[PDB]
Amino acid sequence: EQYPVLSGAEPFYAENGPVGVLLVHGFTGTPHSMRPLAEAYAKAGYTVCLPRLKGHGTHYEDMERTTFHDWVASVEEGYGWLKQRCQTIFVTGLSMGGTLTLYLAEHHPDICGIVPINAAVDIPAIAAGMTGGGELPRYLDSIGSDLKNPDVKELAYEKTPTASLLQLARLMAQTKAKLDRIVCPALIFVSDEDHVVPPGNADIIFQGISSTEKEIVRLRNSYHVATLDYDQPMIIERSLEFFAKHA
Ligand SMILES: *[P@](=O)(CCCN=[N+]=[N-])OCCCCCCCCCCCCCCCC
């Protein structure tokens, strides 16, 4: 990985109480989208790990070299960091961060609870792009930022490698097929007007998981990047309530 990490894309750690929260940012995104959550959780006395996914926060040419196994490894590392100083671990994530949240819970039953936010397990737009017939460039122009608050700017790549999109699709496929192995408590956030990840994904995750304790909280004044959007304080308040309930 050959480019410098952008300002605001650095990983974030905090060693506080014996209860830990792993925060996973999204595809082409940076820890910048999860930072206000991580700080709010850290102030509440929680040990937080906000890792920077491999190939992210630098340059899109760096991400092109990475597989989803790399992104998983970045999260498994954060999970291992939390596992060495916590006995109870929650995982939360936005978009693909939500996908990796689900992925982790499918492999680690010790997860006390998960809080996916606009998690993606099925994006029909990807399949639609490679059946168009036309030539498919090596790098595609990224989808515009999906935020209701106009004063907020997201830290994400201007371009998206085709190879990375294929890696994302494979991750979502393996994640969606293994949903029934999640039994831990789940707090699913979903924006009604998500223009990137179809809101129906929350339904798929809800019906897929074997968790007896699951709930869908619907965000009404936020687009895709809800964690920076208007419903940020609500997400924080609900999550802390969720954490304290199962800690
Ligand atoms: P989340 O992972 C990101 C949220 C925070 N990160 N940021 N910013 O969003 C899920 C990613 C899904 C994006 C897919 C949209 C691309 C559709 C266009 C596809 C055209 C090219 C596809 C052909 C490749 C086979």
Numbering used by the authors: 3 to 249
Paste lines from the article.
Therefore, we determined crystal structures of bMGL in complex with ligands of different alkyl chain lengths (12, 14, and 16 carbons; subsequently referred to as Cx ligands, whereby x refers to the number of carbons in the alkyl chain) to mimic the MG substrates myristoyl-, palmitoyl-, and stearoylglycerol. The bMGL·C14 (palmitoylglycerol mimic) and bMGL·C16 (stearoylglycerol mimic) ligand complexes were crystallized under the same condition equally yielding crystals of space group P21. These structures were determined at resolutions of 1.85 and 2.2 Å, respectively. The bMGL complex structures with the C14 and C16 ligands bound in the active site show clear electron densities for all residues of the cap region. Interestingly, chains A and B of the bMGL·C14 and bMGL·C16 ligand complexes show a partially restricted binding pocket and an open glycerol exit hole similar to conformation II. Chains C and D of the bMGL-C14, and bMGL-C16 ligand structures show even more pronounced restriction of access to the binding pocket accompanied by the closure of the glycerol exit hole denoted as conformation III. The terminal carbon atoms of both the C14 and C16 alkyl chains are located at approximately the same distance from the surface of the protein, close to residues that line the entrance of the binding pocket. The C16 ligand is also fully accommodated in the binding pocket, despite the four additional CH2 groups, due to alkyl chain bending. The necessity for bending might explain the lower substrate turnover rate of bMGL with respect to MGs with a longer fatty acid chain.
Monoacylglycerol lipases (MGLs) play an important role in lipid catabolism across all kingdoms of life by catalyzing the release of free fatty acids from monoacylglycerols. Here, we present a comprehensive study of five crystal structures of MGL from Bacillus sp. H257 in its free form and in complex with different substrate analogs and the natural substrate 1-lauroylglycerol. Crystallographic studies of MGLs have resulted in the determination of three-dimensional structures of human MGL (hMGL) and its ortholog from a moderately thermophilic soil bacterium Bacillus sp. H-257 (bMGL) in free form and in complex with inhibitors. Both MGLs possess the expected α/β-hydrolase core domain harboring a catalytic triad. The occurrence of different conformations reveals a high degree of conformational plasticity of the cap region.
